[model samples]
Target: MVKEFNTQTELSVRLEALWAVLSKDFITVVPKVLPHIVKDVQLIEGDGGVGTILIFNFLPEVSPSYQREEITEFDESSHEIGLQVIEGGYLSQGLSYYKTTFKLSEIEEDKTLVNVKISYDHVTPTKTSQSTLMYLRRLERYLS
Candidate 1:
């Protein structure tokens, strides 16, 4: 079965400045800056854009432990980055494939909108969206 959960958030930050990091630097920034959820980020291959591979290590005792993904889609103008998990994490739950997107848009000079979408094949379809929303909230507080 396939399931997708998406949510939007508002941040008090500039659009361009927000996209600048969320586009690519987020790979490096999130783990270091947001250790409450993400513990570390290590590059596997490529730079930090399309085709890039990374391992997202979460905080100790977190569910599923870690996720290894490859960047598959990227839209510079649209400010969205797509990722496909190729190993570990959710894959351990017998999923066939897992994909997620981090997207953003500007609402005003001091406000920006963040949209996160996660789509995957799973049997139970449990607890995924909660974590995603938690991540977005963390991002919101980190920048705002």
Candidate 2:
């Protein structure tokens, strides 16, 4: 089965600046941008474009310790991207599929709205919001 949830956070940066880093593959900047949740990221295949595959080794604070994901979606015009977990992480358990998407909308010249949409097969995982805020806080504090 597949389940999904959404969360949004306010950001204090120009939409373009945020979009710039996102376009470069969030996996590549995880260690330098926000090393709190992620310990390291590795490129497994492809460039940073769609179809690119990579793995994330997370800190012990996160479950499974690692996740292998693919860049399934990329929309530079809309400032959006989707990272789909193809293997490892929850997939190693009994999950069928998982995807976390980043969607950005600008509020003003220097203010932005960020959204995280997560779709996964899990046990009524309300923690999806936690994960959202986890990344949100990471992005919010690190950037601004």
Candidate 3:
């Protein structure tokens, strides 16, 4: 029912910068960083507030209108924060399907741990590679 993934990146850049690029304005910067995967993200309501919807377009147009929202959110002293799919999410229609979670831990003063877990409807969904989904594919391609 639940699947997972783990990866570490020793980004020379500071955590604040990384956090800014991720947590603060993800809807603004994500499309720019991974244009190949996400065509764009439009804010449907609020100023990045609760129930803010983000529309994502995946590569080759295979996945379209993938929506996600901030149903529950928080800022834990800049250490960690996350968003759960509230409306029109990836697995909105099914119970035992795909979902994702990301956590950041400050491993050291200048290093951080980026842990991610992916829940999928089934195993071996893609023939291109085993245990590789949209996030993993994009991260690996971008980090390179």
Candidate 4:
């Protein structure tokens, strides 16, 4: 079956800043933002755009923790990006496929709104309870 998680959040930073944090800055910022959860982030391909691959290593306490994702879409003009989970965690736990999208909208010169959509298909029956707020919370903490 298919499951989706859609969430919106407001940030005090501008679109450019938000875009940076989601794109290139992601590699450098996330680990610092959630030091207790994410242990490291490694770039396996491309330069933060389509075809780019990222491997995220999580804390030992987490199950099926590490995850690898391929960048499926990267649009700077529209400030949106898409990623597909190619290996690790979710897949290990019976997820057949998974994808996430992040869209940024400018609310003002110094304010921005972000929309996050997470979609997944499972090989085994499962319930969806993931939240995008966790990402937004970490992103905001890292940027601000």
Candidate 3 TM-score, C-alpha based: 0.61
For model 1, what is the C-alpha lDDT against the true structure? Answer: 0.79
Per-residue alpha-carbon lDDT of candidate 3 for residues 1-144, written as tens digits (9 for 90 to 100): 565444444444445655555555666556766676666676666665334555565556644356555523445464444455544445544534544445566767666566554445533334312332344334434434
Off by over 4 Å in 3: 1-9, 85-89, 92-98, 119-144
Give the RMSD in angstroms, all C-alphas superposed, for model 4. 2.7
Please give the distance, in angstroms, between residue 20's alpha carbon in candidate 2 and its true position after superposition. Answer: 2.1
List ranges where model 2 is wrong by over 4 Å. 25-28, 32-36, 60-63
Ranking according to lDDT, highest score first: 4, 1, 2, 3
The collision pairs in model 2 are none
Clashes of 4: 0
Write one digit per residue (lDDT tens) for candidate 4, span 8-125. Answer: 7888887897788887788878778778778999999887689999999999998778999999988888898998989996788878888888899999988898887778886422
lDDT of 4 at 98: 88
Per-model lDDT: 0.79, 0.78, 0.51, 0.80
User: What value does the lDDT take at residue 107 in candidate 3?
Assistant: 68
TM-score of each: 0.81, 0.83, 0.61, 0.87
lDDT for model 2: 0.78
Question: Number of backbone collisions per candidate, in order?
Answer: 0, 0, 0, 0
lDDT of 2 by residue, 81-113 (tens): 898988878787777878888889989988888
Please state the error at residue 30 of candidate 2 in Å: 1.7
* Cα lDDT, model 3, residue 137: 39
- The sequence of per-residue lDDT tens digits that candidate 1 reaches over residues 39-105 is 8889889987799999999888887888899999899888898889999888987888788888888
